[PDB]
Ligand binder design. Structure first.
Ligand SMILES: [Mg+2]
Ligand SMILES: [Zn+2]
Ligand SMILES: [Zn+2]
Lengths: 99, 50, 1343, 49, 76
DNA sequence: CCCTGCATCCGTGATAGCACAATTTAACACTTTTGTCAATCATTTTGTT
DNA sequence: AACAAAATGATTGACAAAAGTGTTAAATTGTGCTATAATGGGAGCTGTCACGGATGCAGGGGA
């Protein structure tokens, strides 16, 4: 198998495959403790922000790559903003103190 | 036609594949014995007895 | 967007109206004819934005000049349609409804706040009975429950000045009217008024919630819903499947049911229904709202059009074994395929097909095809990568120049499951892989797939090259030993090359160097292993980094010479002059690393592989059927044991012997005959060949092709060569009881039907545990890495002198782990000295690397005190000095590393694979050392025997250097031979006890008088003559009879005069309690002397298969569980006594120079009436709980216990783990402390030592002293729920219970953590991202 | 399946682990070649446009 | 070409800042601020400078504050 | 008179008519918008006097 | 060697069929009504087991 970019899921915007380019591999919670055991914090910040989930940060990483400038502007993933709307849809209020 | 590894027989104890390999060469020894007698077209009496 | 640093709290009905952009007042979803979303419905368009990007619903405003103008027909605003994903509505409930989380979760917040039992609130929410509100001046207080009939008379009597409501609206008038300050100010008294432990225990439990509801700023009535908020329409979509059918979520069935029963409840109230109906609507509405939030705490409202239960809101957040966010992230730029061998590679590369290199690296190719100028635009380049023109292979070969990719296998156990490799394009469809690397992944090449990722950015390729490359990982982090060991086939090539025959071609000649031997063997003259004499010049680094050649005339073979041409410069020649099995090759690489670094050890671990692969093919080591040889006497060794089993059957059949000794006397003839048929086999392979020298004959070691594979350690053991040739052992029946008849047939001979069926349970049982030891071990290494998640080396030195004493653990007659294995790579807490003092050889705290570890063995040092991480002084982390050295590297630990996660994996990498005559009467020492006892109260009697007094007597075999080598113990009836300091030869019985006789030693001679041992009272009277025979079994208080329990048996032995003959050493007279399983043969009427038994104490102790341990022992030892039978301890040091008995349980008192402590009745105690003990000593016998060691004996007494009881399960199975990895988990198990005295805290709450140690560093540092605490120890499952973050405890444990309690108290998150930082998607605070977090914390508090 | 002349020996590490090493007269004779027959369907829906 | 960064870790003895010193320098080659190359990428050139002693965390700062004095000139 | 012990029970991991009455989508007309088009107005020497 | 001399898009409007803004038809939609006799009843599983925490009865013991 092989995948560079394809069809993304519906509610969470992470990859899956039905269009001849199936989903990406699975970066489990076991393969993330192997990147924290090292100091690989710049491989881990992109392996779960720009390569999978961040909606308006994974297209900039596609124009910076064709333009010969390898650098990322991460942002915040969408799988987390779908968690602030489900913990708010109970009575529970939850926010982000900005400072 | 194929080269296996011998270090898989001591650990996993499948000694069937080492006896099936000798009764393979044996069964194919009577192969090239009927394939030579029947190739010179010797006789159906020298073949019927083997 | 602005940077964020996260809160949580209840939500008011006037805040939920602020998130919402409109009210949802109809259950319709779409239109069914055209699929435009209907108005006011769930999927509305006026409320949750427009459906199409920048356009109204009708179609008037389609252009883009209108960017904000809301339409006038239908007030849709023309914006982007991702705004349909961040907006919310709200339903306006016609009557309140208790939020189920804050009512039915186990400690009910609605419950323990109002102070009403949960069975009595559930009776009021269902309209089953009223509850008085503001009783006023009547005979009714504030929270009475007037039943349905009692209320009738009440209103008949009083019409006003009395108010009792019913339902969900009554619980609001109780919460809304209660005053929180007049409740908390008053209960400050009641906590001090009541004199009771359970009374003032629950009282503070309600006085803390009331004090957490007034400090955070939440009203109490916010736990009762008044408006419900609805999710955005694009997180609960109704997407149309292909074919005409729609595929909705199942949140549209639970929202369309809250809007119906709420819309019908408005019709029923404006219609003036009878009250018997609008009670069935209120209780029916709030049952649909409590199936929305959390479905299952009620009748489990099953889905419609199907039969499985719906998925409520609290089931999406609730764990699937992972959080909803990142603890899962499927990932772009990746592939996967089958792996194969490819042994032509270096150590830092890997194959990668041209079909995956052209699809993983696609956007990198469109950058070159336009920079190089071949394609004009980026669409025109998308075709050239489709047709695969001759140039794209020129650009794909250039994009892959120095770009490392990250290979990673499926079940990543430890950190070496992800490594990087520099790709090299091959053709095919399988990812090749270097052979030395597969032993780290644990990969066979028989169908194993391996995903390959790609690091994109520029700071993510300098990490896959400096941190995660394949040549940087040569030492495993669990223990410092190497992990690139040449595995299985390159070790059978090294072995065959470096053996020696006795007469081969070219024997005895003399060569002139390794270039002359290889030129002689390849020429066909000399055999590969013939005994030659060569001249080799080896170097050695002795000065300040130099080498000095040293030519000699070595005596070797043509094999060891050809292999000397590979070894680097600075190595000796005696490193390759062995027979070079498998352990000698991983020791040849361990020395080559320490002496020459990493450059020659990576370029030497290859050349050892190209020489083992090449000279293993020249063997043709093929295993025939003449190889596995059956011994000549396998038949007589079995027939002899086949007739010798009949002589134990014939005796039993004639009834001479029972069934118990019939079995064990047959199992011991087979199991001892199985050994003679194996030991008669390895004496046939190992000395197989008998070669001829120039003259007579001679023997040697064999070249049997199936023995070399077992002797080199290449593949197999010696307990498996005995199943191909020897006998196939004894096979255990299903329950575990061993079969009496053993399978006596090998695999070179067949097995009949009846023996192959018996051998199946031993196989079917093995495959049913290897699938269970993984699912049970993948849950131990997930709780460990969530308690040790947030530990990080964050300082260079703290300055504490408190370490732990490191000595070699000595198990009885042998030492298990030397002192070099335990202290290697650890700072020294203080300076150690020689046997002569003031001779400080090791300086102040220095890393005990190789030189200081050999210098300790050069001298005879016995113990060192090293600094452990369990006692470091830093706040939120550990210093780099307290931790130590050991790593994949060898230097000290680098500041910023993440030592919490690499210590939870090295404990969880094993366990997946390892799930599981003896007389000993005479203490047999294998050595010749002086006997030196300590901590004993016992002296020699008349006959020459030190009277045993208690269980405090151990044996120390002091060596010739002032150390110890052996440790023993002393039981009752302990006979003795020597004294103290008198030398003993190896294996001389110094102190002994019979197996089936642990008799009552006589301390002093004299009369025996009957005190609680008359007939009937504690022991019956039995007959015999003066020979002294009987079966008088004096029963203990747990072997005691039914009625006679007010007596405790003992013999208050009087001297010849009849007075109290006191045992010298205390004040008590001689009263030797007849120990467990006692047989008092000496009735009252026999006067005896020293050494003569007062009661016979046998002991079976047979088989040894009556033990515990394994994987369940290591998870339970970490949870800190009470082991069902505590061994009580002496809290405060003093004197002993008894008290009033038969209170159901006895009692005890200890007097310091008033303390009381009661005891059970079955406990065979281990103290007399008067006794002087030390703080933290046993009083009874049993498995000491883990907490009791902590509260009494200290903290270093619990770390020396958790370590040795867990290392005792691994080293029993051959697993290596450095025990720094069991102290950085114990350090996270006792980080909570409870306060005793105060002046700054609340004097009874359980705070963290991180905080209880900053106050006292703050207050006591100022001019006031103004608290004292006591460490707690709670298991790794309850020690993770109680963190100070709530996203690090909600992502792992029960999530409903953690968001419920974190919300009421209004918590906050710095995050300040790894598992809480990876979720938000930013740089973790440990590793390469540690530099940025320090640079960001100092941007706060500055500017 | 087919039955082919097998020889047990370690050959330069191309059969290091369980992996196998196959000659090229086994690919010429075309004896392990299999046939596979897939089905692709192209439906013609009736949209609303 | 590179197989081990053991030389670079000698100069900068951390391995967590050598990844931060070389990513900052390797950007400069990538965006053509600067040209101190045997057909190598920009991340193996940044490691063959640190290996040789011509780059570290101080030589990058002082060469940047000498940029402002340059920018101050044209700043007029 | 008083605090204090054994056993359950619970959560949490691994069968229509109609006859109305009102509402909608669509089929056929408008005028501004933008094109294709030439008889004078403008800025372009073919080669006479 | 200047100005014969003749176009050739500019420059002017005219023409065109192209194109959004309103009035009725036909199919869609929602509300009411419909007197022989009807009456506490609808209703799935069951062979995991583990530990740990509140809750309530009971003995058991200090005043
Ligand atoms: Mg496998
Ligand atoms: Zn509109
Ligand atoms: Zn420290």
């Amino acid at each position: 198998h092989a995948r560079s970019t394809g069809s993304y899921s519906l509610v969470t915007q992470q990859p899956l495959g039905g269009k001849a380019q199936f989903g990406g591999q699975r970066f489990g919670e076991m393969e993330v403790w192997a990147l924290e055991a090292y100091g690989a914090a710049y491989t881990l910040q992109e392996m779960l922000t720009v390569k999978s989930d961040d909606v308006n940060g994974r297209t900039k990483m596609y124009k910076n790559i064709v333009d010969g400038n390898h650098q990322m502007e991460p942002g915040m993933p969408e799988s987390f903003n779908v968690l602030l709307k489900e913990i708010r849809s109970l009575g529970i209020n939850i926010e982000l103190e900005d400072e | 036609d194929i080269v296996l590894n011998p270090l898989g027989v001591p650990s996993r104890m499948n000694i069937g594949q080492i006896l099936e390999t000798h009764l393979g060469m044996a069964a194919k020894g009577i192969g090239d014995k009927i394939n030579a007698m029947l190739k010179q077209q010797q006789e159906v009496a020298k073949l019927r007895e083997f | 967007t602005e940077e964020f640093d996260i809160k949580i709290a209840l939500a008011s009905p006037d805040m939920i109206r602020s998130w919402s952009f409109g009210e949802v007042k109809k259950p319709e979803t779409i239109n069914y004819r055209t699929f435009k979303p209907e108005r006011d419905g769930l999927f509305c368009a006026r409320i949750f934005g427009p459906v199409k990007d920048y356009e109204c619903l009708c179609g008037k405003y389609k252009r883009l000049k209108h960017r904000g103008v809301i339409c006038e027909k239908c007030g849709v605003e023309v914006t982007q349609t991702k705004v349909r994903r961040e907006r919310m509505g709200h339903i306006e409930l016609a009557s309140p409804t208790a939020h189920i989380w804050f009512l039915k979760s186990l400690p009910s917040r609605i419950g323990l706040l109002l102070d009403m039992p949960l069975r009595d609130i559930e009776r009021v929410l269902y309209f089953e009975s009223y509850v008085v509100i503001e009783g006023g001046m009547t005979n009714l207080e504030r929270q009475q429950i007037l039943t349905e009939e009692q209320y009738l008379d009440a209103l008949e009597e009083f019409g006003d000045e009395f108010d009792a409501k019913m339902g969900a609206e009554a619980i609001q008038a109780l919460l809304k009217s209660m005053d929180l300050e007049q409740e908390c100010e008053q209960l400050r008294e009641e906590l001090n008024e009541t004199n009771s432990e359970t009374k003032r225990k629950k009282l503070t439990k309600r006085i803390k919630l009331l004090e957490a509801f007034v400090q955070s700023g939440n009203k109490p009535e916010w736990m009762i819903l008044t408006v419900l908020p609805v999710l955005p329409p694009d997180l609960r979509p109704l997407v149309p499947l292909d074919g005409g059918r729609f595929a909705t979520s199942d949140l549209n069935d639970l929202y369309r049911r809250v809007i119906n029963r709420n819309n019908r409840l408005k019709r029923l109230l404006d219609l003036a229904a009878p009250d018997i109906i609008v009670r069935n609507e209120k209780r029916m509405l709030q049952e649909a709202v409590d199936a929305l939030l959390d479905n299952g705490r009620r009748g489990r409202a099953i889905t419609g059009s199907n039969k499985r239960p719906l998925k409520s809101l609290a089931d999406m957040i609730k764990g699937k074994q992972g959080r909803f966010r990142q603890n899962g992230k499927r990932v772009d730029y990746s592939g996967r395929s089958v792996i194969t061998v490819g042994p032509y590679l270096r150590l830092h590369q890997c194959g990668l097909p041209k079909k995956m290199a052209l699809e993983l690296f696609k956007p990198f190719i469109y950058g070159k095809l336009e920079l190089r100028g071949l394609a004009t635009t980026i669409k025109a380049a998308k075709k050239m990568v489709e047709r695969e023109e001759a140039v794209v292979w020129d650009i794909l070969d250039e994009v892959i120049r120095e770009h490392p990719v990250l290979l990673n296998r499926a079940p990543t156990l430890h950190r070496l499951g992800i490594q990087a490799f520099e790709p090299v394009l091959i053709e095919g469809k399988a990812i090749q892989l270097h052979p030395l690397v597969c032993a780290a992944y644990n990969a066979d090449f028989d169908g194993d797939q391996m995903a390959v990722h790609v690091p994109l950015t520029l700071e993510a390729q300098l990490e896959a090259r400096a941190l995660m490359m394949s040549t940087n990982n040569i030492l495993s982090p669990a223990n410092g030993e190497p992990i690139i060991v040449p595995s299985q086939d390159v070790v059978l090539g090294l072995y065959y090359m470096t053996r020696d025959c006795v007469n081969a071609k070219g024997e005895g000649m003399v060569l002139t160097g390794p270039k002359e031997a290889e030129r002689l063997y390849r020429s066909g003259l000399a055999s590969l292993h013939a005994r030659v004499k060569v001249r080799i010049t080896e170097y050695e680094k002795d000065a300040n980094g130099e080498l000095v050649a040293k030519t000699s005339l070595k005596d070797t073979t043509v094999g060891r010479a050809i292999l000397w041409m590979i070894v680097p410069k600075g190595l000796p020649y005696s490193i390759v002059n062995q027979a070079l099995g498998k352990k000698a090759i991983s020791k040849m690489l361990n020395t080559c690393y320490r002496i020459l670094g990493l450059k020659p050890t990576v370029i030497f671990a290859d050349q050892i592989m190209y020489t083992g692969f090449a000279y293993a093919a020249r063997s043709g080591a093929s295993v025939g059927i003449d190889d596995m040889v059956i011994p000549e006497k396998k038949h007589e060794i079995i027939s002899e044991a086949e007739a010798e089993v009949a002589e134990i059957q014939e005796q039993f059949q004639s009834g001479l012997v029972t069934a118990g000794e019939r079995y064990n006397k047959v199992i011991d003839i087979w199991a001892a005959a199985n050994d003679r048929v194996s030991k008669a086999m390895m004496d046939n392979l190992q000395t197989e060949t008998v070669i001829n020298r120039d003259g007579q004959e001679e023997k040697q070691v064999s070249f049997n092709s199936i023995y070399m594979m077992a002797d080199s350690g290449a593949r197999g053991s010696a307990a498996q060569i005995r199943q191909l040739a020897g006998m196939r052992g004894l096979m255990a029946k299903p329950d575990g009881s061993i079969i009496e008849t053993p399978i006596t047939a090998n695999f070179r001979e067949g097995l009949n039907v009846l023996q192959y069926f018996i051998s199946t349970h031993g196989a079917r049982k093995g495959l049913a545990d290897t699938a269970l030891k993984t699912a049970n071990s993948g849950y131990l290494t997930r709780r460990l890495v969530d308690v040790a998640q947030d530990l990080v080396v964050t300082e260079d030195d703290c300055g504490t002198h408190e370490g732990i004493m490191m000595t070699p653990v000595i198990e009885g007659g042998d030492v298990k782990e030397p002192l070099r294995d335990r202290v290697l790579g650890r700072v020294t807490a203080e300076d150690v000295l020689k046997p002569g003092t003031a001779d400080i050889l090791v300086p102040r705290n220095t890393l005990l690397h190789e030189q200081w570890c050999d210098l300790l063995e050069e001298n005879s040092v016995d113990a060192v005190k090293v600094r452990s991480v369990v006692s470091c002084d830093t706040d939120f982390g550990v210093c780099a000095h307290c931790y130590g050295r050991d790593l994949a590297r060898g230097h000290i630990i680098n500041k910023g590393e993440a030592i919490g996660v690499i210590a939870a994996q090295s404990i969880g990498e094993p366990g997946t694979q390892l799930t599981m005559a003896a007389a000993e009467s005479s203490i047999q020492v294998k050595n010749k050392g002086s006997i030196k006892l300590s901590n004993v109260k016992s002296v020699v009697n008349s006959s020459g025997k030190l009277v045993i007094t208690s269980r405090n007597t151990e044996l120390k075999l002091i060596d010739e250097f002032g150390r110890t080598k052996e440790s023993y113990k002393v039981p009752y009836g302990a006979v003795l031979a020597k004294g103290d300091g008198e030398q003993v030869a190896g294996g001389e019985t110094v102190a002994n006890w019979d197996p089936h006789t642990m008799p009552v030693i006589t301390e002093v001679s004299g009369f025996v008088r009957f005190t609680d041992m008359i007939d009937g009272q504690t022991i019956t009277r039995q007959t015999d003559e003066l020979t002294g025979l009987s079966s008088l079994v004096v029963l203990d208080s747990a072997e005691r009879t039914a009625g006679g329990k007010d007596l405790r048996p003992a013999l208050k032995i009087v001297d010849a005069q009849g007075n109290d003959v006191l045992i010298p050493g205390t004040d008590m007279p001689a009263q030797y309690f007849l120990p467990g399983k006692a047989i008092v043969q000496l009735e009252d009427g026999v006067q005896i002397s020293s050494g003569d038994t007062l009661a016979r104490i046998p002991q079976e102790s047979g088989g040894t298969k009556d033990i515990t341990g394994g994987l369940p022992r290591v998870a339970d030892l970490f949870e800190a569980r009470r082991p069902k039978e505590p061994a009580i301890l002496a809290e405060i040091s003093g004197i002993v006594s008894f008290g009033k008995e038969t209170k159901g349980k006895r009692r005890l008192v200890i007097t310091p120079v008033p303390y009381e402590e009661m005891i059970p009745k079955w406990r065979q105690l281990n103290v007399f009436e008067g006794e002087r003990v030390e703080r933290g000593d046993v009083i009874s016998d049993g498995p000491e709980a883990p907490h009791d060691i902590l509260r009494l004996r200290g903290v270093h007494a619990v770390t020396r216990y958790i370590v040795n009881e867990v290392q005792d399960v691994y080293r029993l199975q051959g697993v290596k783990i450095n025990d720094k990895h069991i102290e950085v988990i114990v350090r996270q198990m006792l980080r909570k402390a409870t306060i005793v005295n105060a002046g700054s805290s609340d004097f009874l709450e359980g705070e963290q030592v991180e905080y209880s140690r900053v106050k006292i560093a703050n207050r006591e540092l100022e001019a006031n002293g103004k608290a004292t605490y006591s460490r707690d120890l709670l298991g790794i499952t309850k020690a993770s729920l109680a963190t100070e973050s709530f996203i690090s405890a909600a992502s792992f444990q029960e999530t409903t219970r953690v968001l419920t309690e974190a919300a009421v108290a209004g918590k906050r998150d710095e995050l300040r953590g790894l598992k809480e930082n990876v979720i938000v998607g930013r740089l973790i605070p440990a590793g390469t991202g540690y530099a940025y977090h320090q640079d960001r914390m100092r941007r706060r508090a500055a500017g | 399946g087919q039955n082919m002349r097998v020889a047990f020996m370690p050959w330069n590490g191309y059969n290091f682990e369980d992996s196998i090493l196959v000659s090229e007269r086994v690919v010429q004779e075309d004896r392990f070649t299999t046939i596979h027959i897939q089905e692709l369907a192209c439906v013609s829906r009736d949209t609303k446009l | 070409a590179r197989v081990t960064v053991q030389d670079a870790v000698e100069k900068i003895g951390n391995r967590f800042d050598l990844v931060l010193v070389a990513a900052r320098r390797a950007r400069q080659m990538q965006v053509g601020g600067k040209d101190l190359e045997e057909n190598d990428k920009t991340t193996v050139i940044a490691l063959r400078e640190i290996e040789e002693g011509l780059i570290n965390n101080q030589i990058l700062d002082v060469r940047e504050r000498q940029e402002q004095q340059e920018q101050e000139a044209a700043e007029l």
